[PDB]
Symmetry: C2
Subunit: 287 residues, 2 copies
Protein backbone atom coordinates (compact mmCIF):
# COMPACT_ATOMS: atom_id res chain seq x y z
CA UNK A 1 0.00 0.00 0.00
CA UNK A 2 1.15 3.49 -0.87
CA UNK A 3 0.60 6.99 0.46
CA UNK A 4 -1.61 9.14 -1.80
CA UNK A 5 -1.93 12.93 -1.73
CA UNK A 6 -5.16 12.83 -3.73
CA UNK A 7 -7.58 10.50 -1.91
CA UNK A 8 -11.04 9.23 -2.81
CA UNK A 9 -12.30 11.44 0.01
CA UNK A 10 -13.19 14.78 -1.56
CA UNK A 11 -11.64 17.79 0.15
CA UNK A 12 -14.53 20.16 0.57
CA UNK A 13 -14.03 23.87 1.20
CA UNK A 14 -15.52 27.34 1.32
CA UNK A 15 -12.52 29.13 -0.21
CA UNK A 16 -13.14 31.43 -3.15
CA UNK A 17 -11.53 30.93 -6.57
CA UNK A 18 -11.15 34.10 -8.65
CA UNK A 19 -11.14 33.06 -12.31
CA UNK A 20 -9.49 35.46 -14.69
CA UNK A 21 -11.22 34.85 -18.00
CA UNK A 22 -14.07 32.49 -17.13
CA UNK A 23 -14.78 31.37 -20.69
CA UNK A 24 -14.47 28.22 -22.82
CA UNK A 25 -15.12 24.68 -21.59
CA UNK A 26 -11.38 24.06 -21.12
CA UNK A 27 -11.80 26.46 -18.19
CA UNK A 28 -15.38 25.84 -17.13
CA UNK A 29 -15.23 22.03 -17.05
CA UNK A 30 -12.92 22.14 -14.02
CA UNK A 31 -15.21 24.58 -12.26
CA UNK A 32 -18.20 22.27 -12.73
CA UNK A 33 -16.20 19.40 -11.24
CA UNK A 34 -15.25 21.47 -8.21
CA UNK A 35 -18.85 22.50 -7.66
CA UNK A 36 -20.02 18.90 -7.87
CA UNK A 37 -17.90 18.05 -4.85
CA UNK A 38 -18.26 21.50 -3.22
CA UNK A 39 -14.52 22.15 -3.41
CA UNK A 40 -15.28 25.87 -2.92
CA UNK A 41 -16.93 28.97 -4.37
CA UNK A 42 -16.20 30.99 -7.55
CA UNK A 43 -15.83 34.59 -8.70
CA UNK A 44 -15.89 34.52 -12.49
CA UNK A 45 -14.51 37.27 -14.68
CA UNK A 46 -15.62 36.55 -18.22
CA UNK A 47 -17.02 37.71 -21.53
CA UNK A 48 -20.01 35.40 -21.91
CA UNK A 49 -21.88 34.21 -18.82
CA UNK A 50 -22.84 30.55 -18.49
CA UNK A 51 -26.19 31.01 -16.81
CA UNK A 52 -26.50 27.26 -16.23
CA UNK A 53 -23.31 27.50 -14.20
CA UNK A 54 -23.94 30.86 -12.57
CA UNK A 55 -27.29 29.73 -11.20
CA UNK A 56 -25.21 27.83 -8.65
CA UNK A 57 -25.47 29.59 -5.28
CA UNK A 58 -21.69 29.27 -5.02
CA UNK A 59 -21.06 31.14 -8.27
CA UNK A 60 -21.03 34.87 -9.03
CA UNK A 61 -20.40 36.31 -12.48
CA UNK A 62 -18.43 39.50 -13.10
CA UNK A 63 -18.81 40.65 -16.70
CA UNK A 64 -15.46 41.51 -18.27
CA UNK A 65 -15.15 42.04 -22.01
CA UNK A 66 -11.37 42.27 -21.87
CA UNK A 67 -8.65 39.76 -21.08
CA UNK A 68 -6.87 42.75 -19.57
CA UNK A 69 -9.74 43.64 -17.27
CA UNK A 70 -10.36 39.93 -16.66
CA UNK A 71 -6.92 39.47 -15.16
CA UNK A 72 -7.20 42.93 -13.57
CA UNK A 73 -10.42 42.11 -11.72
CA UNK A 74 -9.44 38.64 -10.61
CA UNK A 75 -6.22 40.14 -9.24
CA UNK A 76 -8.03 42.92 -7.38
CA UNK A 77 -10.55 40.47 -5.91
CA UNK A 78 -7.64 38.58 -4.36
CA UNK A 79 -5.91 41.77 -3.29
CA UNK A 80 -9.10 42.78 -1.44
CA UNK A 81 -9.50 39.39 0.26
CA UNK A 82 -12.66 38.59 -1.70
CA UNK A 83 -11.04 35.53 -3.29
CA UNK A 84 -8.55 33.06 -1.83
CA UNK A 85 -7.15 31.49 -4.96
CA UNK A 86 -6.24 33.04 -8.32
CA UNK A 87 -7.10 30.96 -11.37
CA UNK A 88 -6.00 31.77 -14.91
CA UNK A 89 -8.99 31.34 -17.24
CA UNK A 90 -9.06 31.52 -21.02
CA UNK A 91 -6.25 34.06 -21.38
CA UNK A 92 -2.49 34.07 -21.90
CA UNK A 93 -0.26 33.41 -18.92
CA UNK A 94 1.67 36.56 -19.92
CA UNK A 95 -1.47 38.61 -19.46
CA UNK A 96 -2.18 37.14 -16.03
CA UNK A 97 1.36 37.52 -14.77
CA UNK A 98 1.71 41.04 -16.09
CA UNK A 99 -0.88 42.02 -13.50
CA UNK A 100 0.23 39.52 -10.85
CA UNK A 101 3.77 40.99 -10.93
CA UNK A 102 2.56 44.61 -10.86
CA UNK A 103 3.79 45.48 -7.37
CA UNK A 104 1.01 47.99 -6.70
CA UNK A 105 -1.38 45.06 -7.08
CA UNK A 106 0.09 43.66 -3.88
CA UNK A 107 0.23 39.99 -4.86
CA UNK A 108 3.99 40.05 -5.29
CA UNK A 109 6.33 39.65 -2.34
CA UNK A 110 10.06 39.15 -1.91
CA UNK A 111 9.91 35.63 -3.32
CA UNK A 112 10.53 34.45 -6.84
CA UNK A 113 7.35 32.96 -8.27
CA UNK A 114 7.61 29.34 -9.39
CA UNK A 115 5.46 26.51 -10.68
CA UNK A 116 5.32 23.34 -8.60
CA UNK A 117 3.48 20.05 -9.04
CA UNK A 118 2.55 17.19 -6.79
CA UNK A 119 2.28 13.73 -8.30
CA UNK A 120 0.74 10.49 -7.15
CA UNK A 121 2.66 7.96 -9.24
CA UNK A 122 1.50 4.37 -8.90
CA UNK A 123 5.06 3.02 -9.14
CA UNK A 124 6.22 5.38 -6.42
CA UNK A 125 5.16 4.87 -2.81
CA UNK A 126 4.59 8.45 -1.72
CA UNK A 127 3.67 11.83 -3.25
CA UNK A 128 6.37 13.52 -5.35
CA UNK A 129 6.79 17.24 -5.71
CA UNK A 130 8.57 18.43 -8.83
CA UNK A 131 9.60 22.06 -9.54
CA UNK A 132 9.95 24.11 -11.63
CA UNK A 133 8.25 22.50 -14.67
CA UNK A 134 6.48 25.44 -16.34
CA UNK A 135 7.65 28.91 -15.26
CA UNK A 136 11.31 29.49 -14.45
CA UNK A 137 13.07 28.72 -17.76
CA UNK A 138 16.77 28.73 -16.96
CA UNK A 139 17.09 29.42 -13.22
CA UNK A 140 20.64 29.73 -11.93
CA UNK A 141 21.79 29.20 -8.35
CA UNK A 142 20.00 32.17 -6.77
CA UNK A 143 16.72 31.27 -8.50
CA UNK A 144 17.11 27.57 -7.70
CA UNK A 145 17.45 28.51 -4.03
CA UNK A 146 14.24 30.51 -4.14
CA UNK A 147 12.56 27.69 -6.08
CA UNK A 148 13.70 25.21 -3.46
CA UNK A 149 12.51 27.61 -0.72
CA UNK A 150 9.07 27.76 -2.35
CA UNK A 151 9.10 23.98 -2.55
CA UNK A 152 9.89 23.83 1.17
CA UNK A 153 7.10 26.20 2.06
CA UNK A 154 4.77 24.08 -0.04
CA UNK A 155 5.88 20.82 1.61
CA UNK A 156 5.34 22.33 5.01
CA UNK A 157 1.98 23.86 4.08
CA UNK A 158 0.62 20.52 2.82
CA UNK A 159 1.96 18.27 5.57
CA UNK A 160 4.96 16.66 3.94
CA UNK A 161 7.13 15.86 6.97
CA UNK A 162 10.78 16.81 6.52
CA UNK A 163 11.13 16.64 2.77
CA UNK A 164 14.08 15.11 1.00
CA UNK A 165 15.11 17.43 -1.80
CA UNK A 166 17.13 16.37 -4.80
CA UNK A 167 18.75 18.81 -7.18
CA UNK A 168 18.34 16.98 -10.48
CA UNK A 169 20.96 16.63 -13.19
CA UNK A 170 22.16 13.98 -15.68
CA UNK A 171 25.04 12.83 -13.47
CA UNK A 172 26.19 13.05 -9.86
CA UNK A 173 29.74 14.16 -10.74
CA UNK A 174 30.04 17.93 -10.46
CA UNK A 175 31.78 19.12 -13.64
CA UNK A 176 32.43 22.38 -15.50
CA UNK A 177 31.19 20.61 -18.64
CA UNK A 178 27.72 20.61 -17.06
CA UNK A 179 26.78 23.85 -15.20
CA UNK A 180 23.59 22.31 -13.85
CA UNK A 181 25.88 20.17 -11.70
CA UNK A 182 27.78 23.16 -10.37
CA UNK A 183 24.61 25.13 -9.70
CA UNK A 184 23.16 22.06 -8.03
CA UNK A 185 26.17 21.94 -5.77
CA UNK A 186 25.93 25.61 -4.82
CA UNK A 187 22.23 25.28 -4.02
CA UNK A 188 23.07 22.40 -1.67
CA UNK A 189 25.80 24.50 -0.02
CA UNK A 190 23.39 27.40 0.54
CA UNK A 191 21.31 25.22 2.84
CA UNK A 192 24.06 23.09 4.34
CA UNK A 193 22.58 20.70 6.89
CA UNK A 194 19.51 22.81 7.66
CA UNK A 195 17.40 20.43 5.53
CA UNK A 196 17.81 17.11 3.70
CA UNK A 197 19.04 18.54 0.41
CA UNK A 198 21.41 16.76 -1.92
CA UNK A 199 22.62 16.78 -5.54
CA UNK A 200 23.51 16.94 -8.31
CA UNK A 201 21.65 13.63 -8.61
CA UNK A 202 20.41 11.89 -11.70
CA UNK A 203 16.79 10.85 -11.34
CA UNK A 204 17.52 7.18 -10.70
CA UNK A 205 19.55 8.09 -7.63
CA UNK A 206 16.85 10.43 -6.37
CA UNK A 207 13.88 8.05 -6.37
CA UNK A 208 15.36 4.53 -6.40
CA UNK A 209 17.14 2.89 -3.47
CA UNK A 210 18.38 0.18 -5.84
CA UNK A 211 19.96 2.68 -8.24
CA UNK A 212 21.68 4.67 -5.51
CA UNK A 213 23.24 1.50 -4.09
CA UNK A 214 24.34 0.43 -7.54
CA UNK A 215 26.08 3.82 -7.77
CA UNK A 216 27.79 3.44 -4.38
CA UNK A 217 25.44 5.86 -2.58
CA UNK A 218 24.85 4.41 0.85
CA UNK A 219 22.57 6.67 2.95
CA UNK A 220 18.80 6.46 3.47
CA UNK A 221 17.67 9.74 1.88
CA UNK A 222 18.61 8.44 -1.54
CA UNK A 223 15.77 6.67 -3.29
CA UNK A 224 13.32 8.59 -1.13
CA UNK A 225 13.26 12.11 -2.51
CA UNK A 226 10.01 13.97 -1.70
CA UNK A 227 10.98 16.97 -3.87
CA UNK A 228 12.90 17.21 -7.14
CA UNK A 229 14.33 20.58 -8.25
CA UNK A 230 14.58 20.65 -12.00
CA UNK A 231 17.85 21.90 -13.49
CA UNK A 232 15.96 23.79 -16.21
CA UNK A 233 12.35 24.10 -17.46
CA UNK A 234 12.73 21.54 -20.25
CA UNK A 235 13.72 18.82 -17.77
CA UNK A 236 10.98 19.67 -15.31
CA UNK A 237 8.36 19.72 -18.06
CA UNK A 238 9.50 16.50 -19.78
CA UNK A 239 9.47 14.79 -16.42
CA UNK A 240 6.01 16.14 -15.62
CA UNK A 241 4.67 14.89 -18.91
CA UNK A 242 6.30 11.45 -18.83
CA UNK A 243 4.74 10.89 -15.44
CA UNK A 244 1.30 11.88 -16.70
CA UNK A 245 1.41 10.17 -20.06
CA UNK A 246 3.58 7.12 -19.41
CA UNK A 247 3.51 6.57 -15.67
CA UNK A 248 -0.26 6.96 -15.28
CA UNK A 249 0.38 9.72 -12.71
CA UNK A 250 -2.26 11.95 -11.12
CA UNK A 251 -0.89 15.47 -10.66
CA UNK A 252 -1.92 18.77 -9.14
CA UNK A 253 -0.02 21.93 -10.08
CA UNK A 254 0.23 25.51 -8.89
CA UNK A 255 2.28 28.67 -9.08
CA UNK A 256 3.54 29.58 -5.63
CA UNK A 257 5.43 32.43 -4.04
CA UNK A 258 2.68 35.06 -4.28
CA UNK A 259 0.29 36.12 -1.51
CA UNK A 260 -2.27 33.60 -2.82
CA UNK A 261 -1.89 30.28 -4.64
CA UNK A 262 -2.27 30.54 -8.40
CA UNK A 263 -3.63 27.93 -10.79
CA UNK A 264 -2.16 28.00 -14.26
CA UNK A 265 -3.34 24.93 -16.10
CA UNK A 266 -2.48 24.05 -19.66
CA UNK A 267 -4.79 23.20 -22.56
CA UNK A 268 -3.72 19.53 -22.53
CA UNK A 269 -4.41 18.73 -18.85
CA UNK A 270 -7.17 16.25 -18.10
CA UNK A 271 -10.15 17.61 -16.18
CA UNK A 272 -9.06 15.30 -13.37
CA UNK A 273 -5.56 16.80 -13.18
CA UNK A 274 -6.96 20.32 -13.42
CA UNK A 275 -9.32 19.55 -10.54
CA UNK A 276 -6.29 18.14 -8.76
CA UNK A 277 -4.66 21.56 -9.21
CA UNK A 278 -7.72 23.19 -7.59
CA UNK A 279 -7.42 20.76 -4.68
CA UNK A 280 -3.73 21.47 -4.29
CA UNK A 281 -4.35 25.22 -4.14
CA UNK A 282 -7.14 24.70 -1.65
CA UNK A 283 -4.66 22.70 0.43
CA UNK A 284 -2.23 25.61 0.04
CA UNK A 285 -4.51 28.32 1.40
CA UNK A 286 -3.36 29.18 4.92
CA UNK A 287 -5.51 31.65 6.87
Amino acid sequence: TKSRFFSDVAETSSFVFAVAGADDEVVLETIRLALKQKLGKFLLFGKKEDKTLTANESVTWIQTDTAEAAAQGAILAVKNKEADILVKGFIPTATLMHHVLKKENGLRTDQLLSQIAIFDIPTYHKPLLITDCAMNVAPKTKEKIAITENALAVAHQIGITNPKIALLSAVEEVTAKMPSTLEAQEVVQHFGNQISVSGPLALDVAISKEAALHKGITDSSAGEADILIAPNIETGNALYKSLVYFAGAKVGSAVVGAKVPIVISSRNDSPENKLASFILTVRLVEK
Copy 2:
Protein backbone atom coordinates in the same frame (compact mmCIF):
# COMPACT_ATOMS: atom_id res chain seq x y z
CA THR B 1 -1.51 -5.12 -29.11
CA LYS B 2 1.64 -3.05 -29.44
CA SER B 3 4.81 -3.16 -31.50
CA ARG B 4 7.90 -4.19 -29.48
CA PHE B 5 11.53 -3.69 -30.48
CA PHE B 6 12.72 -6.23 -27.91
CA SER B 7 10.82 -9.48 -28.52
CA ASP B 8 10.75 -12.78 -26.64
CA VAL B 9 12.60 -14.22 -29.62
CA ALA B 10 16.30 -13.93 -28.83
CA GLU B 11 18.36 -12.27 -31.55
CA THR B 12 21.29 -14.59 -31.99
CA SER B 13 24.52 -13.48 -33.66
CA SER B 14 28.16 -14.17 -34.37
CA PHE B 15 29.34 -10.56 -34.00
CA VAL B 16 32.27 -9.87 -31.72
CA PHE B 17 32.06 -7.58 -28.69
CA ALA B 18 35.35 -5.98 -27.63
CA VAL B 19 35.11 -5.24 -23.90
CA ALA B 20 37.41 -2.55 -22.62
CA GLY B 21 37.98 -3.44 -18.99
CA ALA B 22 36.35 -6.85 -18.62
CA ASP B 23 36.22 -6.83 -14.82
CA ASP B 24 33.61 -6.66 -12.04
CA GLU B 25 30.20 -8.35 -12.14
CA VAL B 26 28.51 -5.10 -13.18
CA VAL B 27 30.28 -5.74 -16.49
CA LEU B 28 30.46 -9.52 -16.60
CA GLU B 29 26.82 -10.22 -15.72
CA THR B 30 25.68 -8.81 -19.07
CA ILE B 31 28.24 -10.91 -20.90
CA ARG B 32 26.97 -14.09 -19.24
CA LEU B 33 23.43 -13.22 -20.30
CA ALA B 34 24.50 -12.68 -23.90
CA LEU B 35 26.34 -15.99 -23.96
CA LYS B 36 23.32 -17.81 -22.57
CA GLN B 37 21.33 -16.79 -25.63
CA LYS B 38 24.34 -16.81 -28.01
CA LEU B 39 23.97 -13.10 -28.75
CA GLY B 40 27.57 -13.15 -30.04
CA LYS B 41 31.23 -13.65 -29.15
CA PHE B 42 33.58 -11.70 -26.83
CA LEU B 43 37.10 -10.26 -26.76
CA LEU B 44 37.82 -9.35 -23.15
CA PHE B 45 40.48 -6.88 -22.09
CA GLY B 46 40.82 -7.15 -18.34
CA LYS B 47 42.96 -7.35 -15.23
CA LYS B 48 41.68 -10.56 -13.66
CA GLU B 49 40.45 -13.38 -15.89
CA ASP B 50 37.20 -15.16 -15.04
CA LYS B 51 38.20 -18.65 -16.07
CA THR B 52 34.64 -19.90 -15.57
CA LEU B 53 33.58 -17.39 -18.19
CA THR B 54 36.59 -17.68 -20.49
CA ALA B 55 36.15 -21.44 -20.80
CA ASN B 56 33.28 -20.56 -23.13
CA GLU B 57 34.33 -21.31 -26.72
CA SER B 58 32.95 -17.89 -27.64
CA VAL B 59 35.19 -16.05 -25.20
CA THR B 60 38.84 -15.02 -25.47
CA TRP B 61 40.73 -13.20 -22.72
CA ILE B 62 43.32 -10.50 -23.37
CA GLN B 63 45.24 -9.67 -20.20
CA THR B 64 45.46 -5.92 -19.63
CA ASP B 65 46.63 -4.53 -16.30
CA THR B 66 45.78 -0.96 -17.26
CA ALA B 67 42.52 0.85 -17.90
CA GLU B 68 44.54 2.77 -20.47
CA ALA B 69 45.70 -0.34 -22.29
CA ALA B 70 42.25 -1.88 -21.76
CA ALA B 71 40.58 0.86 -23.76
CA GLN B 72 43.59 0.92 -26.10
CA GLY B 73 43.32 -2.76 -26.99
CA ALA B 74 39.56 -2.89 -27.32
CA ILE B 75 39.82 0.11 -29.66
CA LEU B 76 42.55 -1.48 -31.78
CA ALA B 77 40.63 -4.76 -32.01
CA VAL B 78 37.74 -2.84 -33.57
CA LYS B 79 40.06 -0.81 -35.76
CA ASN B 80 41.50 -4.07 -37.13
CA LYS B 81 38.07 -5.63 -37.76
CA GLU B 82 38.58 -8.26 -35.06
CA ALA B 83 35.59 -6.98 -33.09
CA ASP B 84 32.29 -5.56 -34.32
CA ILE B 85 31.07 -3.75 -31.24
CA LEU B 86 32.95 -1.68 -28.66
CA VAL B 87 31.85 -2.14 -25.06
CA LYS B 88 33.03 0.00 -22.16
CA GLY B 89 33.91 -2.29 -19.24
CA PHE B 90 34.88 -1.33 -15.70
CA ILE B 91 36.57 1.96 -16.61
CA PRO B 92 35.67 5.63 -16.89
CA THR B 93 33.82 6.81 -19.97
CA ALA B 94 36.47 9.56 -20.25
CA THR B 95 39.16 6.93 -20.58
CA LEU B 96 37.28 5.04 -23.29
CA MET B 97 36.41 8.12 -25.29
CA HIS B 98 39.90 9.55 -25.05
CA HIS B 99 40.99 6.66 -27.22
CA VAL B 100 37.81 6.47 -29.29
CA LEU B 101 38.24 10.13 -30.32
CA LYS B 102 41.96 9.75 -31.08
CA LYS B 103 41.73 10.19 -34.86
CA GLU B 104 44.72 7.93 -35.59
CA ASN B 105 42.69 5.15 -33.97
CA GLY B 106 40.32 5.39 -36.92
CA LEU B 107 37.03 5.00 -35.06
CA ARG B 108 36.15 8.66 -35.44
CA THR B 109 34.54 10.00 -38.59
CA ASP B 110 32.97 13.28 -39.62
CA GLN B 111 29.98 12.76 -37.34
CA LEU B 112 29.42 14.01 -33.84
CA LEU B 113 29.17 11.07 -31.45
CA SER B 114 25.93 10.83 -29.49
CA GLN B 115 24.11 8.54 -27.10
CA ILE B 116 20.74 7.18 -28.19
CA ALA B 117 18.24 4.85 -26.54
CA ILE B 118 15.34 2.76 -27.73
CA PHE B 119 12.47 2.17 -25.35
CA ASP B 120 9.60 -0.28 -25.26
CA ILE B 121 7.13 1.52 -23.01
CA PRO B 122 4.00 -0.43 -22.16
CA THR B 123 1.81 2.69 -22.30
CA TYR B 124 3.16 3.58 -25.72
CA HIS B 125 2.24 1.52 -28.78
CA LYS B 126 5.54 1.47 -30.63
CA PRO B 127 9.28 1.73 -29.89
CA LEU B 128 10.56 5.19 -28.90
CA LEU B 129 14.02 6.48 -29.62
CA ILE B 130 15.29 9.23 -27.35
CA THR B 131 18.56 11.17 -27.84
CA ASP B 132 20.82 12.49 -26.49
CA CYS B 133 20.39 11.35 -22.85
CA ALA B 134 23.98 10.75 -21.68
CA MET B 135 26.70 12.32 -23.85
CA ASN B 136 26.09 15.67 -25.51
CA VAL B 137 25.55 18.02 -22.54
CA ALA B 138 24.40 21.30 -24.05
CA PRO B 139 24.20 20.77 -27.82
CA LYS B 140 23.26 23.83 -29.84
CA THR B 141 21.72 23.86 -33.31
CA LYS B 142 24.68 22.40 -35.22
CA GLU B 143 25.08 19.58 -32.69
CA LYS B 144 21.33 18.94 -32.55
CA ILE B 145 21.38 18.50 -36.33
CA ALA B 146 24.16 15.94 -36.10
CA ILE B 147 22.36 14.26 -33.19
CA THR B 148 19.18 14.11 -35.24
CA GLU B 149 21.20 12.79 -38.22
CA ASN B 150 22.61 10.02 -36.02
CA ALA B 151 19.09 9.28 -34.84
CA LEU B 152 17.98 9.02 -38.47
CA ALA B 153 20.79 6.67 -39.36
CA VAL B 154 19.85 4.57 -36.35
CA ALA B 155 16.15 4.47 -37.28
CA HIS B 156 17.03 3.40 -40.78
CA GLN B 157 19.57 0.82 -39.62
CA ILE B 158 17.05 -0.85 -37.28
CA GLY B 159 14.01 -0.80 -39.55
CA ILE B 160 12.01 2.11 -38.20
CA THR B 161 10.06 3.18 -41.30
CA ASN B 162 10.05 6.94 -41.85
CA PRO B 163 10.55 8.21 -38.35
CA LYS B 164 8.67 11.12 -36.87
CA ILE B 165 11.14 13.32 -35.05
CA ALA B 166 10.20 15.78 -32.35
CA LEU B 167 12.54 18.46 -31.07
CA LEU B 168 11.60 18.54 -27.39
CA SER B 169 11.11 21.64 -25.28
CA ALA B 170 8.80 22.85 -22.48
CA VAL B 171 6.48 24.74 -24.86
CA GLU B 172 5.64 24.92 -28.55
CA GLU B 173 5.90 28.72 -28.73
CA VAL B 174 9.30 29.75 -30.04
CA THR B 175 10.60 32.48 -27.71
CA ALA B 176 13.87 34.28 -26.94
CA LYS B 177 13.18 33.55 -23.26
CA MET B 178 13.80 29.88 -24.05
CA PRO B 179 16.72 29.20 -26.46
CA SER B 180 15.87 25.51 -26.68
CA THR B 181 12.80 26.64 -28.61
CA LEU B 182 14.83 28.72 -31.04
CA GLU B 183 17.40 26.00 -31.55
CA ALA B 184 14.57 23.53 -32.02
CA GLN B 185 13.17 25.74 -34.73
CA GLU B 186 16.50 26.06 -36.54
CA VAL B 187 17.03 22.29 -36.46
CA VAL B 188 13.63 21.85 -38.09
CA GLN B 189 14.52 24.44 -40.76
CA HIS B 190 17.79 22.65 -41.55
CA PHE B 191 15.84 19.62 -42.73
CA GLY B 192 12.78 21.35 -44.14
CA ASN B 193 10.42 18.77 -45.63
CA GLN B 194 13.08 16.14 -46.27
CA ILE B 195 11.85 14.20 -43.22
CA SER B 196 8.99 14.36 -40.70
CA VAL B 197 10.66 16.68 -38.23
CA SER B 198 8.82 19.14 -36.04
CA GLY B 199 9.24 21.23 -32.88
CA PRO B 200 9.71 22.83 -30.49
CA LEU B 201 7.17 20.44 -28.96
CA ALA B 202 6.49 19.72 -25.34
CA LEU B 203 6.43 15.99 -24.66
CA ASP B 204 2.65 15.72 -24.45
CA VAL B 205 2.33 17.02 -28.00
CA ALA B 206 5.01 14.65 -29.25
CA ILE B 207 3.58 11.35 -28.03
CA SER B 208 -0.13 11.99 -27.37
CA LYS B 209 -2.74 12.54 -30.07
CA GLU B 210 -5.16 13.75 -27.38
CA ALA B 211 -2.74 16.40 -26.09
CA ALA B 212 -1.90 17.72 -29.54
CA LEU B 213 -5.60 18.14 -30.36
CA HIS B 214 -6.20 19.85 -27.05
CA LYS B 215 -3.44 22.27 -28.07
CA GLY B 216 -4.94 22.91 -31.52
CA ILE B 217 -2.40 20.75 -33.37
CA THR B 218 -4.30 18.98 -36.11
CA ASP B 219 -1.98 16.78 -38.22
CA SER B 220 -1.25 13.05 -37.89
CA SER B 221 2.46 13.11 -37.03
CA ALA B 222 1.67 14.61 -33.65
CA GLY B 223 1.14 12.02 -30.95
CA GLU B 224 3.18 9.56 -33.00
CA ALA B 225 6.78 10.63 -32.61
CA ASP B 226 9.25 7.75 -33.20
CA ILE B 227 12.25 9.88 -32.13
CA LEU B 228 12.62 12.60 -29.51
CA ILE B 229 15.62 14.96 -29.63
CA ALA B 230 16.39 16.20 -26.16
CA PRO B 231 16.97 19.94 -25.75
CA ASN B 232 19.82 19.28 -23.30
CA ILE B 233 21.34 16.28 -21.47
CA GLU B 234 19.40 16.82 -18.24
CA THR B 235 16.07 16.51 -20.07
CA GLY B 236 17.12 13.46 -22.05
CA ASN B 237 18.43 11.74 -18.94
CA ALA B 238 15.45 12.57 -16.71
CA LEU B 239 13.16 11.28 -19.42
CA TYR B 240 15.21 8.12 -19.82
CA LYS B 241 15.07 7.45 -16.12
CA SER B 242 11.37 8.22 -15.63
CA LEU B 243 10.58 5.74 -18.36
CA VAL B 244 12.70 3.05 -16.74
CA TYR B 245 11.74 3.67 -13.14
CA PHE B 246 8.16 4.88 -13.39
CA ALA B 247 6.90 3.72 -16.76
CA GLY B 248 8.21 0.15 -16.47
CA ALA B 249 10.11 0.67 -19.74
CA LYS B 250 12.60 -1.75 -21.29
CA VAL B 251 15.45 0.17 -22.93
CA GLY B 252 18.53 -0.48 -25.02
CA SER B 253 21.17 2.24 -25.34
CA ALA B 254 24.22 2.93 -27.46
CA VAL B 255 26.68 5.59 -28.53
CA VAL B 256 26.50 6.07 -32.28
CA GLY B 257 28.34 8.04 -34.91
CA ALA B 258 31.60 6.08 -34.82
CA LYS B 259 32.70 3.33 -37.22
CA VAL B 260 31.29 0.73 -34.80
CA PRO B 261 28.43 0.85 -32.30
CA ILE B 262 29.55 1.53 -28.73
CA VAL B 263 27.94 0.32 -25.52
CA ILE B 264 28.31 2.63 -22.56
CA SER B 265 26.12 1.34 -19.78
CA SER B 266 25.78 2.89 -16.36
CA ARG B 267 26.20 1.30 -12.94
CA ASN B 268 22.45 1.50 -12.22
CA ASP B 269 21.13 -0.28 -15.35
CA SER B 270 19.40 -3.61 -14.84
CA PRO B 271 21.11 -6.62 -16.40
CA GLU B 272 18.07 -6.83 -18.67
CA ASN B 273 18.48 -3.26 -19.96
CA LYS B 274 22.22 -3.77 -20.37
CA LEU B 275 21.55 -6.91 -22.40
CA ALA B 276 19.05 -4.82 -24.32
CA SER B 277 21.91 -2.44 -25.12
CA PHE B 278 23.95 -5.39 -26.47
CA ILE B 279 20.99 -6.39 -28.63
CA LEU B 280 20.57 -2.87 -29.93
CA THR B 281 24.24 -2.69 -30.94
CA VAL B 282 24.00 -6.08 -32.58
CA ARG B 283 21.02 -4.72 -34.52
CA LEU B 284 23.18 -1.71 -35.41
CA VAL B 285 26.07 -3.63 -36.94
CA GLU B 286 25.85 -3.28 -40.72
CA LYS B 287 28.37 -5.28 -42.78
